Amino acid sequence: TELRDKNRKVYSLFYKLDVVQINNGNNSSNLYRLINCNTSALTQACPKVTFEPI
Amino acid sequence: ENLWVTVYYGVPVWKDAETTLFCASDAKAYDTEVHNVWATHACVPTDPNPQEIYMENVTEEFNMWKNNMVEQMHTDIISLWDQSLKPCVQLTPLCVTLDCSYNITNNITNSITNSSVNMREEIKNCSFNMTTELRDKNRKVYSLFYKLDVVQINNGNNSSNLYRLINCNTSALTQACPKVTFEPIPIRYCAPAGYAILKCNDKEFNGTGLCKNVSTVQCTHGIRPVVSTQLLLNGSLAEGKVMIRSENITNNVKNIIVQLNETVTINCTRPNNNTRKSVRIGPGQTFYATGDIIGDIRQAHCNVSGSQWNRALHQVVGQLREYWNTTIIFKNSSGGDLEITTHSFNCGGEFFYCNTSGLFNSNWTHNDTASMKPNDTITLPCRIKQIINMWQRVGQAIYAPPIQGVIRCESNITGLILTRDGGGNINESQIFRPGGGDMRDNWRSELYKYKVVRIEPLGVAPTKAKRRVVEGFLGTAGSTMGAASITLTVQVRKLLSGIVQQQSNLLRAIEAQQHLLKLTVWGIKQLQARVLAVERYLRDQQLLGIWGCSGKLICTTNVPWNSSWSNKSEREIWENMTWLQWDKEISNYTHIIYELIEESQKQQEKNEQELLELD
Amino acid sequence: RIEPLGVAPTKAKRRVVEGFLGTAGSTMGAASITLTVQVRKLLSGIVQQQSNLLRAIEAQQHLLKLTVWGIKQLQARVLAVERYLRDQQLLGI
Amino acid sequence: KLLSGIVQQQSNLLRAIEAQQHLLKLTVWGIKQLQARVLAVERYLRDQQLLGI
Ligand SMILES: *[C@@H]1O[C@H](CO)[C@@H](O[C@@H]2O[C@H](CO)[C@@H](O[C@@H]3O[C@H](CO[C@H]4O[C@H](CO)[C@@H](O)[C@H](O)[C@@H]4O)[C@@H](O)[C@H](O[C@H]4O[C@H](CO)[C@@H](O)[C@H](O)[C@@H]4O)[C@@H]3O)[C@H](O)[C@H]2NC(C)=O)[C@H](O)[C@H]1NC(C)=O
Ligand SMILES: *[C@@H]1O[C@H](CO)[C@@H](O[C@@H]2O[C@H](CO)[C@@H](O[C@@H]3O[C@H](CO)[C@@H](O)[C@H](O)[C@@H]3O)[C@H](O)[C@H]2NC(C)=O)[C@H](O)[C@H]1NC(C)=O
Ligand SMILES: *[C@@H]1O[C@H](CO)[C@@H](O[C@@H]2O[C@H](CO)[C@@H](O[C@@H]3O[C@H](CO)[C@@H](O)[C@H](O)[C@@H]3O)[C@H](O)[C@H]2NC(C)=O)[C@H](O)[C@H]1NC(C)=O
Ligand SMILES: *[C@@H]1O[C@H](CO[C@@H]2O[C@@H](C)[C@@H](O)[C@@H](O)[C@@H]2O)[C@@H](O[C@@H]2O[C@H](CO)[C@@H](O)[C@H](O)[C@H]2NC(C)=O)[C@H](O)[C@H]1NC(C)=O
Ligand SMILES: *[C@@H]1O[C@H](CO)[C@@H](O[C@@H]2O[C@H](CO)[C@@H](O)[C@H](O)[C@H]2NC(C)=O)[C@H](O)[C@H]1NC(C)=O
Ligand SMILES: *[C@@H]1O[C@H](CO)[C@@H](O[C@@H]2O[C@H](CO)[C@@H](O)[C@H](O)[C@H]2NC(C)=O)[C@H](O)[C@H]1NC(C)=O
Ligand SMILES: *[C@@H]1O[C@H](CO)[C@@H](O[C@@H]2O[C@H](CO)[C@@H](O)[C@H](O)[C@H]2NC(C)=O)[C@H](O)[C@H]1NC(C)=O
Ligand SMILES: *[C@@H]1O[C@H](CO)[C@@H](O)[C@H](O)[C@H]1NC(C)=O
Ligand SMILES: *[C@@H]1O[C@H](CO)[C@@H](O)[C@H](O)[C@H]1NC(C)=O
Ligand SMILES: *[C@@H]1O[C@H](CO)[C@@H](O)[C@H](O)[C@H]1NC(C)=O
Ligand SMILES: *[C@@H]1O[C@H](CO)[C@@H](O)[C@H](O)[C@H]1NC(C)=O
Ligand SMILES: *[C@@H]1O[C@H](CO)[C@@H](O)[C@H](O)[C@H]1NC(C)=O
Ligand SMILES: *[C@@H]1O[C@H](CO)[C@@H](O)[C@H](O)[C@H]1NC(C)=O
Ligand SMILES: *[C@@H]1O[C@H](CO)[C@@H](O)[C@H](O)[C@H]1NC(C)=O
Ligand SMILES: *[C@@H]1O[C@H](CO)[C@@H](O)[C@H](O)[C@H]1NC(C)=O
Ligand SMILES: *[C@@H]1O[C@H](CO)[C@@H](O)[C@H](O)[C@H]1NC(C)=O
Ligand SMILES: *[C@@H]1O[C@H](CO)[C@@H](O)[C@H](O)[C@H]1NC(C)=O
Ligand SMILES: *[C@@H]1O[C@H](CO)[C@@H](O)[C@H](O)[C@H]1NC(C)=O
Ligand SMILES: *[C@@H]1O[C@H](CO)[C@@H](O)[C@H](O)[C@H]1NC(C)=O
Ligand SMILES: *[C@@H]1O[C@H](CO)[C@@H](O)[C@H](O)[C@H]1NC(C)=O
Ligand SMILES: *[C@@H]1O[C@H](CO)[C@@H](O)[C@H](O)[C@H]1NC(C)=O
Ligand SMILES: *[C@@H]1O[C@H](CO)[C@@H](O)[C@H](O)[C@H]1NC(C)=O
Ligand SMILES: *[C@@H]1O[C@H](CO)[C@@H](O)[C@H](O)[C@H]1NC(C)=O
Ligand SMILES: *[C@@H]1O[C@H](CO)[C@@H](O)[C@H](O)[C@H]1NC(C)=O
Ligand SMILES: *[C@@H]1O[C@H](CO)[C@@H](O)[C@H](O)[C@H]1NC(C)=O
Ligand SMILES: *[C@@H]1O[C@H](CO)[C@@H](O)[C@H](O)[C@H]1NC(C)=O
Ligand SMILES: *[C@@H]1O[C@H](CO)[C@@H](O)[C@H](O)[C@H]1NC(C)=O
Structure with missing residues (x-):
């Protein structure tokens, strides 16, 4: 908080490709890590700044 | 008859400037041998004798509100504040x-005075x-904290020893680097080469309009931009008469x-003294943290000598008769931001908000004598705050550290x-109440005399002289055209005094003890201003x-001046134009004259002569 | 790049003691009089500089925000000068 | 050889980076070197x- x-404990929605299961998840609702977190860090994209071309 | 154009340089010219200022301070600020008390950066110390040369029989406009000085001033102040904020340790886990x-x-919880502050003692001890x-x-460790620093968490039934920081939930927070203090220094803002400051010594001259008593200066008077709302502290007084200004008196x-x-x-x-626990x-x-305070915790109060305040108000209300003889009303701030709700400032770093209690009374x-008779030693409450959002910069907040020792404050x-x-009648009566929202108002209040001015040494004039064909900073010109030819050596020398400014920099990395990088918009834009002047x-x-x-x-000219100009005598041009009305008359044709002197003077140059020579 | 320096052998000898870049497509004698068209703009970096207006900010407020772009532009100005x-x-x- | 510091400057090649890759990497050294160039000029x-x- x-x-x-x-x-x-708050809830949200994530894409299918942005995460991958972990802990030898043969068949269950096992946990999910991020695809890029264990490789490198991550931060917000500053939503006020748009990424359109000029 | 023949109007041979002639070019001159180093001629006194004064125009509207838009450039960068340069911080400076007296030698006493730098001899304090502290890293920085709140201005003492590696800024250029002041020249041993900044020339303030008078100038009479001249005219110049003024719009103090439209000046770009306070913009750059508060920008550089916020930059220096961020720089001093950088080395401070963060307070996020708190x-x-x-x-x-x-x-x-x-012992004491209820003092002699009660102004709805005894119960709001803002003194608790917290683990x-x-x-x-x-x-x-x-x-777990314990210390002492105020009530204004936090607020009871209203998610439960009541407080029940449960609080949350007011600024934490909005943004982060870091300490204020207690080795750095928050005391004022006289700040002098110098201009680059080709630029100067123009001061109006007329007392009746209001904040805008025309002025004649000109003084050309290199660096402004040392300003003390004290953070003060609804009041100005340690500022210049209007000698001879109280000055009253406004953007729009009708509004x-x-x-x-x-x-x-x-x-x-x-x-x-x-x-009551203060303590510290690292x-x-x-x-x-x-x-x-603010440790356990020794002695009875007396409520921090304040007092004002109403006797002299009565005389000050008498002189003011004598000055407040703009378009009336006897009608005025005084009121208090009914509500708004805390900076506007009460007279806010800082005294040694602790944000002292001493109330505007007896102002509206x-x-x-x-x-007028009815208010002069009741000589009232106005005792009042004065609060203290540890945190503040400077200039509505709601980011990494600043915590005021302990100030250890008994705290006195004079201002x-x-x-x-x-x-x-x-919300009142227009002509039935006038109401006034204190407002301290915009801090830039207090800063431009002292800059109504000073105005940045550009030097344009270029000059043109028609005379009867011609070459052979092939085949006292800025003064002593109120009305002159011949005197400019005499001062072509002094004014040219003073036009390029930037090297004297650069000589006294002492900016190797650091000046007093030690610093971080601390190289920001100020120094790089100063170097940019040097580069652009060069x-x-x-x-x-x-x-x-x-x-x-x-x-x-x-320098003469081969092309004679065309006859498009309106007829005028050379003597009248020399006597009653001061080199400026003439430039006003040739404003658009100046580019044509440039093109002529650049093209015809060069392309029409023959190669040699062969007929007769010493050989 | 532009190298305004040019050389040529002619009969002219000094005394001894004892339209950005156009207006010459293929010329050497007529190109020997249009020199100022290039020289006037050769040292006219202030023209491109006057339109910066980078006092601190443009719209409300910004941070320090001075990076490789501005300092490289200043260095380019310095070296061109x-x-x-x-x-x-x-x-x- | 008085104002011939351009000979020393031509070999710099500080385009952004030299050897493999780098961050911004422009600090008191480079900016004060440029200041010294400007002042000597x-x-x-x-x-x-x-x-x-
Ligand atoms: C960090 O936490 C603090 C404290 O919670 C937030 O600061 C303000 O918190 C209050 C209370 O949650 C916000 O709501 C204000 O309520 C005032 C009356 O309080 C009663 O009613 C509210 C429900 O509205 C109850 O929750 C509460 O318990 C009380 O019973 C209103 O008077 C306020 O609006 C009016 O007054 C203000 C001030 O005069 C006017 O400016 C308004 O225009 C309006 O007329 C207000 O609704 C309050 O909004 C919080 N402040 C802000 C700026 O939002 C911080 O907000 C919080 N940090 C962040 C980032 O949210
Ligand atoms: C700064 O001082 C002013 C002036 O005293 C405060 O404004 C208002 O002052 C009046 C004084 O008469 C307060 O009214 C009185 O309140 C008491 C206690 O409730 C009551 O017994 C009296 O009959 C009278 O109504 C008024 O409350 C007060 N305004 C507020 C909002 O409290 C001002 O509060 C002072 N500000 C600070 C920060 O000290
Ligand atoms: C306007 O200017 C005056 C004079 O410069 C300021 O007076 C200052 O007042 C404070 C206390 O109110 C003095 O504080 C003391 O400083 C010494 C410094 O060694 C310290 O040892 C003491 O423990 C105490 O803190 C201060 O010296 C004094 N003079 C200064 C700063 O020059 C006044 O504060 C100014 N007005 C405002 C609003 O700041
Ligand atoms: C915070 O998490 C704890 C632990 O749950 C695990 O971690 C979560 C991040 C998520 O991955 C879950 O799927 C995991 O099972 C939650 O569980 C309780 O935590 C409290 C406090 O430590 C403990 O007293 C209880 O016994 C825990 N109960 C269970 C069933 O694990 C906790 O509920 C989460 N926070 C909130 C506010 O719900
Ligand atoms: C400004 O002065 C007015 C008095 O004209 C104060 O008004 C009182 O405010 C309190 C709130 O604490 C009320 O309980 C009183 O009923 C009000 N009285 C009147 C006559 O209005 C006001 O509080 C003052 N505000 C400030 C910030 O000083
Ligand atoms: C000098 O001024 C005169 C008059 O102001 C200019 O005369 C112009 O002559 C052309 C013909 O070549 C006419 O078409 C214009 O109408 C004339 N001007 C006016 C105002 O009537 C003359 O061209 C100017 N010469 C220079 C070199 O500027
Ligand atoms: C130079 O050209 C400008 C271009 O308009 C002139 O500006 C006008 O001047 C007249 C009076 O001289 C004013 O009535 C107009 O309002 C001005 N134009 C604008 C847009 O305000 C200027 O006068 C010319 N100056 C000289 C000396 O010829
Ligand atoms: C990091 O997680 C991804 C996804 O499984 C994968 O590259 C690998 O498991 C981890 N990386 C390494 C180097 O083990
Ligand atoms: C408070 O101080 C007074 C003297 O000023 C003393 O008589 C009294 O006992 C003290 N009370 C406490 C609780 O210390
Ligand atoms: C204390 O409160 C009373 C009534 O609430 C008031 O008459 C008195 O003026 C207050 N004290 C001071 C110093 O104002
Ligand atoms: C306040 O206390 C009452 C009684 O204990 C309780 O019913 C109520 O829910 C409490 N309020 C809250 C939790 O906001
Ligand atoms: C004009 O300025 C000069 C500056 O030397 C000063 O001596 C003089 O008193 C001023 N006059 C007025 C009327 O302000
Ligand atoms: C300042 O004085 C001038 C006359 O010198 C006047 O025209 C102007 O209206 C005054 N300023 C204000 C804000 O009234
Ligand atoms: C405060 O005013 C007095 C004159 O009343 C003056 O001597 C003193 O210098 C002023 N304080 C400052 C400028 O800090
Ligand atoms: C106070 O102000 C009045 C008018 O505003 C002025 O005449 C008087 O000289 C001032 N007092 C001084 C300078 O001591
Ligand atoms: C001042 O404001 C009034 C209305 O409040 C307006 O009519 C007038 O034109 C304004 N004057 C100036 C100089 O802005
Ligand atoms: C008045 O001011 C003096 C001077 O600081 C202070 O000692 C005193 O406590 C104040 N209050 C009074 C006399 O009620
Ligand atoms: C203003 O009114 C007062 C009465 O209180 C009077 O003494 C004074 O002479 C008047 N001043 C004018 C009309 O300038
Ligand atoms: C000031 O008081 C006197 C009586 O002492 C009165 O005659 C006069 O009208 C008052 N002033 C005004 C402007 O009403
Ligand atoms: C001034 O305020 C007092 C109350 O504080 C009131 O009795 C008086 O009528 C007011 N006078 C004017 C001229 O507003
Ligand atoms: C206030 O002080 C003045 C001194 O200038 C005196 O004449 C007057 O009687 C005093 N008033 C009161 C109510 O003490
Ligand atoms: C407590 O106050 C006294 C003033 O009498 C002061 O000398 C002492 O240093 C203070 N204690 C601290 C700062 O711990
Ligand atoms: C307090 O007031 C009196 C003068 O009215 C005197 O003791 C001293 O100048 C003042 N001290 C301050 C403001 O610290
Ligand atoms: C104020 O203006 C109204 C009309 O707008 C007028 O009737 C009234 O007499 C004026 N006030 C005074 C004191 O003359
Ligand atoms: C001002 O000085 C004299 C006297 O007013 C005047 O003749 C001259 O034209 C003016 N300008 C100067 C001295 O530059
Ligand atoms: C020019 O100025 C001088 C001195 O100021 C004056 O004697 C002369 O009459 C003026 N001539 C004009 C305005 O034509
Ligand atoms: C370019 O060369 C052609 C052929 O020699 C010539 O006709 C033309 O005038 C030259 N100049 C230009 C195109 O500016």
């Missing part, structure tokens, strides 16, 4:  | 939920978890800029930025060399 |  | 201005 120790 | 206790083992230097090791929304004639003391004091949180990151409408008064109420002089010398005029300032 | 400075020094020599 | 420029005077 905005507080330091406070944690909240 | 945002955990805490438990505090209001009533503590101290908080902090990580040890090692990763997993943590520990009530515009601020009522004021500059007073005298000053009065303000004893705002926290008598608790190490991380690998070399330590928070200097006055009405000098019918009998002059030189100007009250009032505002007129729009480029201007280079293009000037290039145009001289193209015309063959690089050997001397006086 | 140094080239013509060395040229004019050689001319004076 | 400005000194003799003012000298030549005094000559022309």
Whole structure:
């Protein structure tokens, strides 16, 4: 949360390609890591800045 | 008869400038041998004698509100503030939920004064978890904190020793580098070569309009841009008369800029001492919390000498008779931002907000003496805040560290930025109340005299002289054309005094003890201004060399001046134009004259002569 | 690149003591009078510079935001000025 | 050889990077070197201005 120790279980939606299962997930709803997190870091794309050409 | 064009340089010319200023300060600021108390960067120390040359029998316009000085000033101030913010350790792990206790083992909780602040003592002692230097090791430790720093978490029933920082949930927070303080220094802003400052010494001259008593200057008077809302501290007084200005007197929304004639003391004091506790949180990151205070915790109060304030208000309301004889109303700020709701400032780094309590308790409408008789030693409450969003920059906040020792605060008064109420009658009566929203108002209040001015040494004139065909900074010109020919050596020498500015830089990396990189828009744009001034002089010398005029300032012309100009005598041109009205008359044809002197003078040059020679 | 320096042998000898770039497609005598068309704009970097207006910001507010672009532009200005400075020094020599 | 610092500058080749790859990598060294270039040029420029005077 905005507080330091406070944690909240919130829900969202992720793409199918942006994550991959882990922990030898033969058949179950096992956890999922990010495809690029263990390789390198990640940060927000600054949504106010658009990526259109001029 | 023959109107041979003639070019001149180093001629006194004054125009509207838009360039970069350069920070500076007196020698005392740099001899303090501290890394930086709040201006003392590696800025160029002031020249031993910045020339302020008078100039009479001249005229120049002024629009103080349209000046670009305060823009760059607050930009560089915010940049230096960020630079000083960089080395500070962060306070992000401090945002955990805490438990505090209001009533503590101290004697006084209710002082003699009660202004809805005794119950709001803003003094609690609070425990908080902090990580040890090692990763997993943590520990709970206690300190003292105010009520304004946090707010009770309303998610539960009540506070119940549960609080959250007001600024943490909005943005991050870092300390204010306590080795750096927040005290004022006289700041002098110098101009580059080809640019200067123009000061108007006329007292009755208001913030805008025309002025004649000109003074050309290299660096402004040392300004103290003290952070002050609804009041100006340690600013220049309007000698001889109280100055009242505004953007639009008909519009009530515009601020009522004021500059007073005298000053009065303000004893705002926290008598009870302060303490410090440097608790190490991380690998070399330590928070200097406000430890346990010794002695009775007296409520930080303030006092004002209303006797001299009565005389100041008498002189003001004598000055407030703009378009009336007896009608005025004074009111308080009914609400808004905390900077506008109360007179806000800082005193040594702690954000002291000493109240505007007794400001609205006055009405000098019918009998001025009725307000002079009640000599009231105005005791009032004054609060303190640890955090602030400077210039609405809601980012990495700044925490004010302990100020250890009994806290006294004295501050002059030189100007009250009032505002007129729009929700009132127009001519029945006028209401004024304090407003401290825009900080740039207080800064331009002292710059109504100073205005940046450009030097355009180029000059043209028709005379009867012609060459052979082939086949005192800026003064002593109020009305002259012949005197400019005498001063062609001094003005040209002063036109390129930028090397004297660059000589005294002392910017190797650091000046006083130690610094970070700290190289930002200020220094690089100063170097850019140097480069652009040198480029201007280079293009000037290039145009001289193209015309063959690089050997001397006086340079004739082969083409005679056309007859499109309106008829005028040469003596009248020399007596009553001061070199400026003539340039006003040839504004559009100047490019044609440039083209003529550049093309015909060069292409029509024959090669040699052979008939007769010493051989 | 533009190298305005040009040389040619002719009969002209000094006394002894004792339209950006056009208007010459194929010319040597007529090109010997159109020199100023190139020289006037050769040292006219201020023309391109005057339209910057980079006081601090443009729209409301920005951070420091001065990077390889601006400093490389300043360096290009400096070196282009140094080239013509060395040229004019050689001319004076 | 007085104002001939361009000979020293021509070999720099600081386009962005030299050896394999780099970050921005422009600090007190390069900017103060450029400042020294500008000041050394400005000194003799003012000298030549005094000559022309
Ligand atoms: C970090 O946390 C702080 C504290 O929670 C936020 O600061 C403000 O918090 C208040 C309370 O949540 C916000 O709401 C304000 O409520 C005022 C009345 O409070 C009662 O009603 C609210 C529900 O509206 C209850 O939740 C509350 O318990 C009280 O019972 C209103 O008066 C405010 O709006 C009016 O007054 C203001 C001030 O006069 C006017 O400017 C408004 O135009 C309006 O007339 C307000 O609704 C308040 O919004 C929070 N501030 C801001 C700026 O949003 C911080 O916001 C939070 N950080 C972030 C990033 O959100
Ligand atoms: C700064 O000082 C001013 C002036 O005192 C404060 O504004 C208002 O002052 C009046 C004084 O009469 C307060 O009204 C009084 O309140 C008491 C206590 O509730 C009551 O017993 C009286 O009958 C009278 O109504 C008024 O409350 C006060 N305004 C507010 C918003 O409290 C101002 O509060 C002071 N500000 C600070 C930060 O100290
Ligand atoms: C306007 O200018 C005056 C004079 O310059 C400022 O007076 C300053 O007042 C403070 C206390 O109110 C003094 O603080 C003391 O500083 C010494 C420095 O060694 C320190 O040892 C003490 O413990 C104490 O903190 C300060 O010296 C004094 N003079 C200064 C700063 O020159 C006044 O503060 C200015 N107005 C405003 C609004 O800042
Ligand atoms: C926070 O997570 C804990 C642990 O759950 C695991 O970690 C999560 C990030 C997610 O990956 C889950 O699928 C994992 O199972 C949640 O579980 C409780 O945590 C509390 C606090 O430590 C503990 O007292 C309970 O016993 C835990 N209960 C269970 C069933 O694991 C926790 O609920 C999450 N936070 C919130 C606000 O729901
Ligand atoms: C400004 O002055 C007015 C008085 O004209 C104050 O008004 C009082 O405000 C309190 C709020 O605490 C109310 O309880 C009173 O009923 C109000 N009285 C009147 C006559 O309006 C106002 O609080 C003052 N505001 C500030 C910021 O000082
Ligand atoms: C000098 O001024 C005169 C008059 O201002 C110019 O005369 C112009 O002559 C042309 C014919 O070549 C006419 O078409 C114009 O109408 C004339 N001007 C006016 C205002 O009537 C003359 O051209 C100017 N010469 C130079 C070199 O500028
Ligand atoms: C130079 O040309 C400009 C171009 O218009 C002239 O500007 C006009 O001047 C007249 C009076 O001289 C004003 O009534 C107009 O309002 C001006 N134009 C604008 C758009 O404001 C200027 O006067 C010319 N100056 C000279 C000396 O000839
Ligand atoms: C990181 O995760 C991805 C996805 O499984 C894969 O490259 C691999 O498992 C990890 N990388 C390495 C170097 O092990
Ligand atoms: C507070 O101080 C007074 C003297 O000023 C003393 O008589 C009294 O006992 C003190 N009370 C406490 C709780 O310390
Ligand atoms: C304390 O409160 C009373 C009534 O609430 C008020 O009359 C008195 O003026 C207050 N004290 C001060 C110093 O204003
Ligand atoms: C406040 O307390 C009451 C009684 O304990 C409870 O019913 C109510 O839910 C509490 N309010 C909250 C949790 O917001
Ligand atoms: C004009 O400026 C000069 C500056 O030397 C000053 O001596 C003089 O008193 C000023 N006059 C007025 C009327 O302000
Ligand atoms: C300032 O004075 C001039 C006259 O010198 C006047 O025209 C102008 O309106 C005044 N400024 C304001 C804001 O009224
Ligand atoms: C405050 O005003 C007095 C005159 O009343 C003056 O001597 C003093 O220098 C002023 N304080 C400053 C400028 O800090
Ligand atoms: C106070 O102001 C009045 C008018 O504003 C002025 O006449 C007087 O000289 C001032 N007092 C001084 C300068 O001591
Ligand atoms: C001042 O404001 C009034 C209306 O409030 C408007 O009529 C007038 O034109 C304005 N004057 C100036 C100089 O802005
Ligand atoms: C407090 O007021 C008096 C003068 O009215 C005097 O003790 C001193 O000048 C002031 N002290 C301050 C403002 O620190
Ligand atoms: C008045 O001001 C003096 C000077 O700082 C202060 O000691 C005193 O506590 C103030 N309050 C009064 C007299 O009520
Ligand atoms: C303004 O009114 C007062 C009455 O309070 C009077 O003494 C003064 O002479 C008047 N001034 C004018 C009309 O200029
Ligand atoms: C001034 O305010 C007082 C109350 O504070 C009021 O009695 C008086 O009528 C007011 N006078 C004017 C001229 O507004
Ligand atoms: C000031 O008071 C006197 C009586 O003391 C009164 O005659 C006069 O009208 C008052 N002034 C005004 C402007 O009403
Ligand atoms: C206020 O002080 C003045 C001194 O100028 C005195 O004449 C007057 O009687 C005093 N008023 C009160 C109410 O003490
Ligand atoms: C407590 O206050 C006294 C003032 O009498 C001061 O000398 C002392 O340093 C203060 N204690 C601190 C700062 O720990
Ligand atoms: C104010 O203006 C109104 C009309 O707009 C007029 O009737 C009234 O007499 C004016 N006020 C005074 C004091 O004359
Ligand atoms: C101002 O000085 C004299 C006297 O007013 C006047 O004749 C001259 O034209 C003006 N300009 C100067 C001295 O530059
Ligand atoms: C020009 O100025 C001089 C001195 O200021 C004056 O004597 C002369 O009459 C003026 N001539 C004009 C305005 O034609
Ligand atoms: C280019 O060359 C052709 C052929 O020699 C010639 O006719 C033309 O005038 C030249 N100049 C141009 C195209 O500007």
